[PDB]
Short mmCIF file of C-alpha atoms in Angstrom, two decimals:
data_model
loop_
_atom_site.label_atom_id
_atom_site.label_comp_id
_atom_site.label_asym_id
_atom_site.label_seq_id
_atom_site.Cartn_x
_atom_site.Cartn_y
_atom_site.Cartn_z
CA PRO F 106 90.85 136.51 131.42
CA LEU F 107 91.29 133.12 132.19
CA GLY F 108 93.03 131.16 129.25
CA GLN F 109 94.95 127.72 128.53
CA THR F 110 97.39 127.17 125.68
CA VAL F 111 99.02 123.88 124.57
CA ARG F 112 101.13 123.85 120.95
CA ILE F 113 103.11 120.95 120.22
CA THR F 114 104.23 121.85 116.76
CA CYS F 115 105.18 117.71 116.04
CA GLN F 116 103.84 114.76 118.94
CA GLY F 117 105.81 112.69 117.01
CA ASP F 118 109.20 111.17 116.37
CA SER F 119 110.35 112.94 112.82
CA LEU F 120 113.38 110.82 110.95
CA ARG F 121 114.80 111.13 106.93
CA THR F 122 114.86 107.92 107.00
CA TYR F 123 114.02 104.59 108.89
CA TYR F 124 115.84 101.08 108.13
CA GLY F 125 114.72 98.00 110.32
CA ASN F 126 112.16 97.44 112.21
CA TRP F 127 109.59 98.91 114.43
CA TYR F 128 108.02 97.86 118.01
CA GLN F 129 105.68 101.20 118.61
CA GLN F 130 103.35 101.25 121.62
CA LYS F 131 101.83 104.28 122.46
CA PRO F 132 98.09 104.78 124.03
CA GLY F 133 97.59 108.27 124.53
CA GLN F 134 97.51 111.18 121.37
CA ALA F 135 94.62 112.49 123.15
CA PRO F 136 94.18 115.93 124.27
CA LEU F 137 91.75 116.16 127.17
CA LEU F 138 90.12 120.13 127.71
CA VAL F 139 87.39 119.13 130.32
CA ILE F 140 86.30 122.74 132.20
CA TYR F 141 84.99 121.44 135.15
CA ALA F 142 85.78 118.19 136.21
CA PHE F 143 96.25 99.13 128.06
CA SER F 144 97.34 95.15 128.16
CA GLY F 145 97.97 95.42 124.49
CA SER F 146 100.72 92.74 123.65
CA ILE F 147 103.40 92.63 120.36
CA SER F 148 104.59 89.11 120.81
CA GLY F 149 106.25 86.20 118.86
CA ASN F 150 106.54 87.93 115.48
CA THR F 151 108.99 87.49 113.05
CA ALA F 152 110.64 90.18 111.09
CA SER F 153 113.29 89.27 108.66
CA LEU F 154 114.75 92.69 106.36
CA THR F 155 118.35 92.45 103.97
CA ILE F 156 118.15 96.12 101.89
CA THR F 157 121.73 95.31 99.43
CA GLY F 158 121.28 98.35 97.34
CA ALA F 159 120.26 101.91 97.88
CA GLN F 160 121.31 105.21 96.79
CA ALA F 161 119.97 108.02 98.55
CA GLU F 162 120.86 111.02 96.70
CA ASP F 163 117.91 113.16 98.24
CA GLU F 164 116.86 117.37 98.66
CA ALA F 165 116.46 119.24 101.84
CA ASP F 166 113.44 118.66 104.30
CA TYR F 167 111.54 120.63 106.47
CA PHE F 168 110.06 119.32 109.60
CA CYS F 169 107.70 120.65 111.97
CA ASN F 170 109.34 124.22 111.17
CA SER F 171 105.86 126.51 112.29
CA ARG F 172 104.85 130.29 112.06
CA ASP F 173 102.10 130.05 113.35
CA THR F 174 100.23 132.54 115.60
CA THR F 175 98.03 130.40 118.88
CA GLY F 176 96.57 131.69 121.76
CA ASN F 177 92.86 132.34 123.66
CA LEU F 178 91.16 135.54 123.15
CA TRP F 179 92.62 138.88 120.50
CA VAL F 180 95.41 136.65 118.21
CA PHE F 181 96.49 138.69 115.26
CA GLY F 182 98.51 136.19 112.83
CA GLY F 183 100.53 136.78 109.69
CA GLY F 184 102.03 140.08 108.71
CA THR F 185 98.65 141.35 109.43
CA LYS F 186 98.69 144.59 108.55
CA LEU F 187 96.70 146.81 111.27
CA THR F 188 96.09 151.22 112.21
CA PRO O 207 86.59 135.62 129.13
CA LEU O 208 87.72 131.92 129.57
CA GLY O 209 89.53 129.26 126.65
CA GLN O 210 91.23 126.71 126.40
CA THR O 211 93.28 125.57 122.87
CA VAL O 212 95.23 123.07 122.01
CA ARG O 213 97.33 123.20 118.71
CA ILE O 214 98.87 119.87 117.33
CA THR O 215 100.47 120.09 114.40
CA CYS O 216 101.20 116.37 113.93
CA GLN O 217 100.00 113.87 116.59
CA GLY O 218 101.71 111.02 114.20
CA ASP O 219 105.12 110.20 112.91
CA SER O 220 106.79 111.95 110.00
CA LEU O 221 109.33 110.46 107.84
CA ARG O 222 110.84 110.96 104.25
CA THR O 223 111.64 106.95 104.02
CA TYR O 224 110.93 104.38 105.64
CA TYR O 225 112.36 100.41 104.77
CA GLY O 226 111.29 97.19 106.94
CA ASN O 227 108.70 96.78 109.61
CA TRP O 228 106.19 98.71 111.62
CA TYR O 229 103.99 96.83 115.04
CA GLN O 230 102.24 99.89 115.84
CA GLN O 231 99.78 100.20 118.67
CA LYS O 232 98.40 103.84 118.84
CA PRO O 233 95.48 103.59 121.23
CA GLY O 234 93.79 107.19 121.61
CA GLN O 235 93.48 110.10 119.07
CA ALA O 236 90.97 111.82 120.57
CA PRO O 237 90.28 115.14 121.18
CA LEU O 238 87.80 114.52 124.41
CA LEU O 239 86.08 118.87 125.16
CA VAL O 240 83.79 118.36 127.61
CA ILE O 241 82.41 121.51 130.03
CA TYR O 242 80.61 119.28 132.35
CA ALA O 243 81.80 116.10 133.42
CA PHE O 244 92.79 97.90 125.11
CA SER O 245 93.44 94.23 125.37
CA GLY O 246 94.73 94.33 121.43
CA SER O 247 97.39 92.13 120.22
CA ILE O 248 100.18 92.56 116.97
CA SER O 249 101.15 88.26 117.57
CA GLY O 250 102.39 85.18 115.29
CA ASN O 251 103.05 87.19 112.30
CA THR O 252 105.90 86.45 109.71
CA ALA O 253 107.41 89.32 107.40
CA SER O 254 109.83 88.38 104.52
CA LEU O 255 111.77 91.54 103.58
CA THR O 256 114.33 92.28 100.37
CA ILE O 257 114.59 95.63 98.48
CA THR O 258 117.49 94.87 96.06
CA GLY O 259 118.03 97.94 93.99
CA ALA O 260 116.74 101.22 95.05
CA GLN O 261 117.44 104.42 94.16
CA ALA O 262 115.69 108.14 95.61
CA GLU O 263 116.33 110.52 93.62
CA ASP O 264 113.54 112.99 95.68
CA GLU O 265 113.10 116.86 95.51
CA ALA O 266 112.71 118.32 99.56
CA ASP O 267 110.12 117.21 101.70
CA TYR O 268 108.21 120.24 103.87
CA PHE O 269 105.92 118.07 106.28
CA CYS O 270 103.99 120.18 109.74
CA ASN O 271 105.67 123.82 108.30
CA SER O 272 101.65 125.20 109.58
CA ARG O 273 100.76 129.07 109.19
CA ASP O 274 97.74 128.91 111.38
CA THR O 275 96.56 131.25 112.92
CA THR O 276 94.31 129.50 116.27
CA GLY O 277 92.18 130.52 119.43
CA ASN O 278 89.36 131.17 121.61
CA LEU O 279 87.36 134.47 120.33
CA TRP O 280 88.07 137.25 117.88
CA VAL O 281 91.62 135.51 115.85
CA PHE O 282 92.12 137.42 113.10
CA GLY O 283 94.17 135.28 110.54
CA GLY O 284 96.93 135.66 107.55
CA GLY O 285 96.86 139.53 106.18
CA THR O 286 94.16 140.79 107.38
CA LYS O 287 94.37 144.10 106.79
CA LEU O 288 92.29 146.16 109.42
CA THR O 289 91.72 149.50 110.40
CA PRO V 60 82.70 134.18 126.64
CA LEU V 61 83.80 130.51 126.59
CA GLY V 62 85.27 128.18 124.36
CA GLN V 63 87.50 125.34 123.99
CA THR V 64 88.86 125.06 120.49
CA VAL V 65 91.02 121.75 119.49
CA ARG V 66 93.05 122.60 116.37
CA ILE V 67 94.96 119.09 115.19
CA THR V 68 96.82 119.09 111.65
CA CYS V 69 97.57 115.87 110.97
CA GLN V 70 96.81 113.13 113.51
CA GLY V 71 97.87 110.24 110.81
CA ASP V 72 101.83 109.56 109.62
CA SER V 73 103.17 111.52 107.53
CA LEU V 74 105.58 109.66 104.89
CA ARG V 75 107.54 109.94 101.59
CA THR V 76 108.34 106.36 101.08
CA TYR V 77 107.22 103.55 102.94
CA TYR V 78 108.44 99.71 101.75
CA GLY V 79 107.26 96.79 103.67
CA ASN V 80 104.80 95.52 105.91
CA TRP V 81 103.55 97.96 108.76
CA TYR V 82 100.57 96.12 111.61
CA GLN V 83 99.01 98.85 113.01
CA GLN V 84 96.10 99.36 115.99
CA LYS V 85 95.06 102.59 116.76
CA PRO V 86 91.42 102.33 117.57
CA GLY V 87 90.20 105.74 118.50
CA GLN V 88 90.08 108.61 116.43
CA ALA V 89 86.63 110.21 117.28
CA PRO V 90 86.91 114.19 118.79
CA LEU V 91 84.09 113.45 121.58
CA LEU V 92 82.29 116.51 121.80
CA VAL V 93 79.89 116.68 125.72
CA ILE V 94 78.52 119.53 127.37
CA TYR V 95 77.13 118.20 130.37
CA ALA V 96 78.09 114.85 130.37
CA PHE V 97 89.56 96.93 122.03
CA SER V 98 90.26 92.47 121.85
CA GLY V 99 91.77 92.52 118.22
CA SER V 100 94.03 90.97 117.19
CA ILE V 101 95.97 90.79 114.01
CA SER V 102 97.82 86.83 114.41
CA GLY V 103 99.42 84.70 111.74
CA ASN V 104 99.54 86.30 108.63
CA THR V 105 102.71 85.98 106.51
CA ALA V 106 103.42 88.94 104.70
CA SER V 107 106.59 88.44 101.56
CA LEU V 108 107.90 91.26 99.57
CA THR V 109 110.97 92.20 97.23
CA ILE V 110 111.53 95.42 95.41
CA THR V 111 113.70 94.85 92.86
CA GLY V 112 113.83 97.47 90.55
CA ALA V 113 112.91 101.18 92.09
CA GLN V 114 113.48 104.53 90.93
CA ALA V 115 111.75 106.89 92.51
CA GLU V 116 112.43 111.00 90.51
CA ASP V 117 110.09 112.76 93.02
CA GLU V 118 109.07 116.16 92.38
CA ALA V 119 108.68 117.80 96.38
CA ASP V 120 106.04 117.11 98.96
CA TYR V 121 104.00 119.54 101.54
CA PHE V 122 102.68 117.56 104.30
CA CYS V 123 100.73 119.70 106.89
CA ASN V 124 101.10 122.78 105.71
CA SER V 125 98.80 124.77 106.79
CA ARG V 126 97.37 128.42 106.26
CA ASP V 127 93.65 128.37 108.71
CA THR V 128 91.83 130.66 111.08
CA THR V 129 90.30 128.41 113.67
CA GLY V 130 88.12 129.47 117.24
CA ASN V 131 85.09 130.43 118.49
CA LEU V 132 82.91 132.52 118.51
CA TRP V 133 84.98 136.08 116.11
CA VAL V 134 87.37 134.44 113.48
CA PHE V 135 88.77 136.62 110.48
CA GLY V 136 90.30 134.48 108.02
CA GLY V 137 92.84 134.98 105.28
CA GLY V 138 93.24 138.52 104.19
CA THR V 139 90.24 140.10 105.67
CA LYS V 140 90.02 144.21 104.43
CA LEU V 141 87.84 145.11 107.75
CA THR V 142 87.53 148.71 108.41
CA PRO N 222 94.45 138.22 133.62
CA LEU N 223 95.51 134.72 133.99
CA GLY N 224 96.96 132.39 131.97
CA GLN N 225 99.10 128.98 131.47
CA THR N 226 100.73 128.56 128.02
CA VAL N 227 102.97 125.26 127.21
CA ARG N 228 104.78 125.41 123.83
CA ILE N 229 106.55 122.51 123.03
CA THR N 230 107.97 122.12 119.28
CA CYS N 231 109.05 118.51 119.27
CA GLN N 232 107.16 116.50 121.71
CA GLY N 233 109.09 113.33 119.60
CA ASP N 234 112.88 112.08 118.99
CA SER N 235 113.76 113.51 115.71
CA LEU N 236 116.65 111.25 113.47
CA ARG N 237 118.09 111.53 109.52
CA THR N 238 118.78 108.15 110.45
CA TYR N 239 117.49 105.55 112.18
CA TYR N 240 119.30 101.60 111.10
CA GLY N 241 118.18 98.68 113.36
CA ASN N 242 115.15 97.61 116.21
CA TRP N 243 113.52 100.12 117.71
CA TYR N 244 111.66 98.92 120.94
CA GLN N 245 109.20 101.80 122.08
CA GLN N 246 106.57 102.08 124.68
CA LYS N 247 105.27 105.80 125.24
CA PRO N 248 102.15 106.11 127.30
CA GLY N 249 101.30 109.13 126.89
CA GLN N 250 101.58 112.28 125.00
CA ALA N 251 97.69 114.46 125.72
CA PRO N 252 97.87 117.53 127.08
CA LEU N 253 95.30 117.58 129.96
CA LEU N 254 93.76 121.17 130.14
CA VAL N 255 91.12 121.07 133.08
CA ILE N 256 90.19 124.58 135.36
CA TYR N 257 88.65 123.37 138.01
CA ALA N 258 89.63 119.21 138.76
CA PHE N 259 99.88 100.31 131.43
CA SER N 260 100.54 96.26 130.99
CA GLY N 261 101.38 96.45 127.75
CA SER N 262 104.11 94.33 126.98
CA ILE N 263 107.24 93.92 123.51
CA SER N 264 107.63 90.95 123.90
CA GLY N 265 109.33 87.02 122.35
CA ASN N 266 109.52 88.47 118.54
CA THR N 267 112.60 88.06 115.91
CA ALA N 268 114.32 90.91 114.75
CA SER N 269 116.92 90.36 111.28
CA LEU N 270 118.57 92.71 109.12
CA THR N 271 121.39 93.11 107.23
CA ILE N 272 122.16 96.84 105.19
CA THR N 273 124.88 95.55 102.54
CA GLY N 274 125.22 98.85 100.12
CA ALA N 275 123.59 101.90 101.71
CA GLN N 276 125.17 105.43 100.05
CA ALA N 277 123.34 108.05 101.28
CA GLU N 278 124.06 111.97 99.56
CA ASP N 279 121.35 113.43 101.09
CA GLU N 280 121.05 116.95 101.63
CA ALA N 281 120.83 118.79 104.17
CA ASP N 282 117.45 118.30 107.18
CA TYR N 283 115.43 121.59 109.06
CA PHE N 284 113.85 119.71 112.31
CA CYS N 285 111.40 121.44 115.06
CA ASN N 286 113.19 125.08 114.10
CA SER N 287 110.63 126.98 114.42
CA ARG N 288 109.18 130.89 114.34
CA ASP N 289 105.14 130.61 115.82
CA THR N 290 104.44 133.40 118.30
CA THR N 291 102.03 131.84 121.04
CA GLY N 292 100.52 132.84 124.30
CA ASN N 293 97.04 134.17 126.03
CA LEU N 294 94.90 137.11 125.17
CA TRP N 295 96.69 139.79 123.26
CA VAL N 296 98.72 137.96 119.91
CA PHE N 297 100.38 139.59 117.41
CA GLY N 298 102.33 137.05 114.95
CA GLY N 299 104.96 137.46 112.54
CA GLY N 300 106.02 140.82 110.82
CA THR N 301 103.15 142.22 112.19
CA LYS N 302 103.14 146.10 111.30
CA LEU N 303 101.10 147.65 113.84
CA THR N 304 99.77 152.18 113.79
CA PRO H 56 98.35 139.73 136.08
CA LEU H 57 99.66 135.33 136.61
CA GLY H 58 101.30 133.36 133.77
CA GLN H 59 102.68 130.12 134.23
CA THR H 60 104.93 129.75 131.24
CA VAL H 61 106.60 126.56 129.60
CA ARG H 62 108.42 126.82 126.30
CA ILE H 63 110.52 123.42 125.33
CA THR H 64 111.93 123.72 121.70
CA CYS H 65 112.39 119.67 122.17
CA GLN H 66 111.05 116.70 124.89
CA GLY H 67 113.05 114.17 122.97
CA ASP H 68 116.27 112.62 122.36
CA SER H 69 117.82 114.43 118.61
CA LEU H 70 120.02 112.42 116.66
CA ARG H 71 122.26 112.70 113.40
CA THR H 72 122.64 108.65 113.32
CA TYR H 73 122.19 105.94 115.56
CA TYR H 74 122.90 102.01 114.25
CA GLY H 75 121.58 99.77 116.46
CA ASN H 76 118.64 98.59 118.58
CA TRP H 77 116.43 101.67 121.12
CA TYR H 78 115.22 99.92 124.17
CA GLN H 79 113.17 102.18 124.85
CA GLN H 80 110.30 103.61 127.58
CA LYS H 81 108.72 106.73 127.72
CA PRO H 82 105.69 106.83 129.38
CA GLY H 83 104.86 110.51 130.33
CA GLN H 84 105.04 113.38 127.27
CA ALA H 85 101.36 115.31 128.37
CA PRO H 86 101.68 118.69 129.91
CA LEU H 87 98.69 118.90 132.76
CA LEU H 88 97.79 122.37 132.42
CA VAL H 89 95.26 122.73 135.95
CA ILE H 90 94.08 125.90 137.29
CA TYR H 91 92.45 124.34 141.26
CA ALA H 92 92.96 121.07 141.21
CA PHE H 93 104.03 101.82 134.34
CA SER H 94 104.02 97.45 134.37
CA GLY H 95 104.87 98.17 130.80
CA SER H 96 107.64 95.70 129.59
CA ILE H 97 110.26 94.70 126.92
CA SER H 98 111.20 91.61 127.60
CA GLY H 99 112.66 88.11 125.61
CA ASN H 100 112.72 90.00 121.91
CA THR H 101 115.99 88.52 120.19
CA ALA H 102 117.59 91.71 118.06
CA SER H 103 120.52 90.03 115.57
CA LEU H 104 121.74 93.71 113.32
CA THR H 105 124.45 93.42 109.92
CA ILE H 106 125.61 96.75 108.43
CA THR H 107 128.38 96.00 106.22
CA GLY H 108 128.44 98.34 103.88
CA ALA H 109 126.73 101.98 104.26
CA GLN H 110 128.65 105.61 103.51
CA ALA H 111 126.74 108.59 103.79
CA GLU H 112 127.81 111.64 103.16
CA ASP H 113 124.95 114.21 104.04
CA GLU H 114 124.78 117.49 104.43
CA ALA H 115 124.11 119.82 107.69
CA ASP H 116 121.35 119.47 110.66
CA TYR H 117 119.44 122.34 111.69
CA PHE H 118 117.85 120.37 114.99
CA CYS H 119 115.99 122.68 117.56
CA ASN H 120 117.46 125.93 116.55
CA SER H 121 114.21 128.21 117.32
CA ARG H 122 112.92 131.91 116.64
CA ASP H 123 109.82 131.53 119.24
CA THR H 124 108.36 134.23 120.61
CA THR H 125 105.87 133.11 123.39
CA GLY H 126 104.48 133.79 126.78
CA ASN H 127 101.66 134.79 127.86
CA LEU H 128 99.37 138.58 127.95
CA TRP H 129 100.45 141.03 125.03
CA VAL H 130 103.86 138.71 123.02
CA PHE H 131 104.60 140.16 119.77
CA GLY H 132 106.71 137.36 117.51
CA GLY H 133 109.16 138.15 114.91
CA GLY H 134 109.94 142.03 113.17
CA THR H 135 106.89 143.44 114.72
CA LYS H 136 107.39 147.33 113.15
CA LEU H 137 105.33 149.26 116.28
CA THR H 138 104.49 152.80 116.35
CA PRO R 18 102.67 140.99 138.44
CA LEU R 19 103.68 137.66 139.40
CA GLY R 20 105.33 134.86 136.44
CA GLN R 21 106.77 131.51 136.21
CA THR R 22 108.66 130.66 133.39
CA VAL R 23 110.94 127.51 132.26
CA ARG R 24 112.31 126.88 129.03
CA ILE R 25 113.94 124.27 127.99
CA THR R 26 115.88 124.30 124.34
CA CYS R 27 116.71 120.35 125.00
CA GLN R 28 115.17 117.39 127.26
CA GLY R 29 117.05 115.07 125.88
CA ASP R 30 120.19 113.32 124.86
CA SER R 31 121.73 115.27 121.90
CA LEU R 32 123.93 112.67 119.58
CA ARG R 33 125.78 112.73 116.00
CA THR R 34 126.55 109.51 116.06
CA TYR R 35 125.45 106.56 118.03
CA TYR R 36 126.78 103.37 117.41
CA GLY R 37 125.38 99.94 119.45
CA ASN R 38 122.06 98.65 121.80
CA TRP R 39 120.13 101.87 124.16
CA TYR R 40 117.85 100.68 127.33
CA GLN R 41 116.14 104.55 128.35
CA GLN R 42 113.48 104.20 131.01
CA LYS R 43 112.76 108.12 131.16
CA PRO R 44 109.45 107.86 132.67
CA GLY R 45 108.34 111.93 133.28
CA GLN R 46 108.21 114.22 130.66
CA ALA R 47 105.34 116.14 131.85
CA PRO R 48 105.59 119.30 132.45
CA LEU R 49 102.34 120.17 135.55
CA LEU R 50 101.25 124.04 135.33
CA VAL R 51 99.44 123.75 138.17
CA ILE R 52 97.62 127.29 139.83
CA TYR R 53 96.05 126.08 143.15
CA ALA R 54 96.97 122.01 144.48
CA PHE R 55 106.51 103.15 137.69
CA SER R 56 107.00 99.39 137.89
CA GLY R 57 108.56 98.83 134.08
CA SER R 58 111.06 96.85 133.24
CA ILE R 59 113.83 96.10 129.95
CA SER R 60 114.94 92.15 131.03
CA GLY R 61 116.34 89.48 128.82
CA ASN R 62 116.14 90.85 125.70
CA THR R 63 119.23 90.11 123.77
CA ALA R 64 120.27 92.77 120.90
CA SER R 65 124.20 91.32 118.04
CA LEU R 66 125.06 94.33 116.68
CA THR R 67 127.90 93.94 113.59
CA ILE R 68 129.00 96.85 111.83
CA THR R 69 132.05 96.30 109.12
CA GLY R 70 131.88 99.15 106.91
CA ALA R 71 131.00 102.21 108.12
CA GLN R 72 132.04 105.72 106.07
CA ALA R 73 129.84 109.29 107.20
CA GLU R 74 131.57 112.01 105.58
CA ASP R 75 128.93 114.01 107.34
CA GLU R 76 127.96 117.97 107.24
CA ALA R 77 127.97 120.13 109.84
CA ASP R 78 125.40 119.62 112.51
CA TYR R 79 123.24 122.42 115.03
CA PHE R 80 121.92 120.87 117.77
CA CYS R 81 119.71 123.76 120.58
CA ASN R 82 120.51 126.75 119.31
CA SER R 83 117.21 128.78 119.34
CA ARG R 84 117.22 132.45 119.26
CA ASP R 85 113.81 132.98 121.93
CA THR R 86 112.26 134.99 123.53
CA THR R 87 109.86 133.54 126.35
CA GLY R 88 108.58 135.30 129.48
CA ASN R 89 105.42 136.59 130.61
CA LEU R 90 103.07 139.36 130.02
CA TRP R 91 104.84 142.15 127.47
CA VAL R 92 107.14 139.60 124.91
CA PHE R 93 108.58 141.22 121.85
CA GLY R 94 110.95 139.04 120.17
CA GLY R 95 113.26 139.08 116.80
CA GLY R 96 114.09 142.63 115.58
CA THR R 97 110.99 144.28 116.90
CA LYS R 98 111.60 147.84 115.94
CA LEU R 99 109.33 149.28 118.30
CA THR R 100 108.57 153.70 118.53
#
């Protein structure tokens, strides 16, 4: 029995608040599963931002708090009652 | 029994609030599953933003909190009562 | 028994609030499953935005909180009562 | 029984508050699973930001606090009652 | 029984507050699992930032406090009651 | 029984507050698991920052305080009641 498991809960950036400009170049997010085997530019853009009044009375955030049961072959997830 | 499992709950950015300009270049999000085997530009754009009054009394956020049961071959998910 | 499983709950960006301009170049979101085997531009656009009064008394958000049972061959999902 | 497990709860940056400009080049986030085996530029952009009034009375944040049960072959997750 | 386990709770930077400009070049975040086996530039960008009024009465942050049970072969996670 | 375990709770920088400019070059964060076996530049950028009023009455931070049970072969995590 051979198996190759990759569990990633978030491949990304996790924020409660972002004010401003975000220049982002993230070419690859592609899982390549193989059993037998970027000149992109962000250029000359103008970004003008002004936040004068902001009130954020927010409640709690729950990001990437997983409860999974992952693997290969026999996987029993959650409150599996087995007899 | 061979198997190759990739479980990703979010491949993306997770935010409660974003104010502003987002320049984003994310070419690849394609899982390639193979058993036997970008000159794009964002350029010269003008972005003018002004938020004067903002009130955000928001409630809680639950992002990417999975409960899955993933794998290959035998997978029993949730409260599977087995006898 | 061989099998190749990719489970992705979100391939995308997950937000409660976005105010502003979003320049987005995401060429590929295509799962390619093969057993035997972008000069696009966003340019010169003008974006003028002004939010003066905003009140957002919102309730809770539940994003990408999956409960799936995924795999190959034998998959028993949810509260499968088996005897 | 051979197996190769990679569990990553967050591959990304985790913040409660970000004010400002973010130049980000993150080419690779692609798990490559193989049993037998970037000239991109952010250039000349202008970013003008001003936050005058900000009040953020926010509640608690729970980022990347996973409860998973990951692996290969036999995986029993959560409060599995086994007899 | 051979197995190779890598458990990383955060591969990223974890902050409660960030004010300013972030130039970031992080090419590789790709777990490569193999059983048998960057000229990118951020250049000439102008970043102007001014935060005059900021009040942040925030609540507690819980970052990367995992409770997982990870490994290869037999993995029993959480309060598994076994008899 | 052979196994090779790497448990890293944070591969990243952990801060409560950051004011200023961050030039960051972190090429590699990729766990390479193999059983049988960067000319990037940040150059000429201008960063202007001014924080005049800042008040941060924040609550406690809990960063990288894990409770995991990691390994290879037999792993029993949390308050596993075994008989």
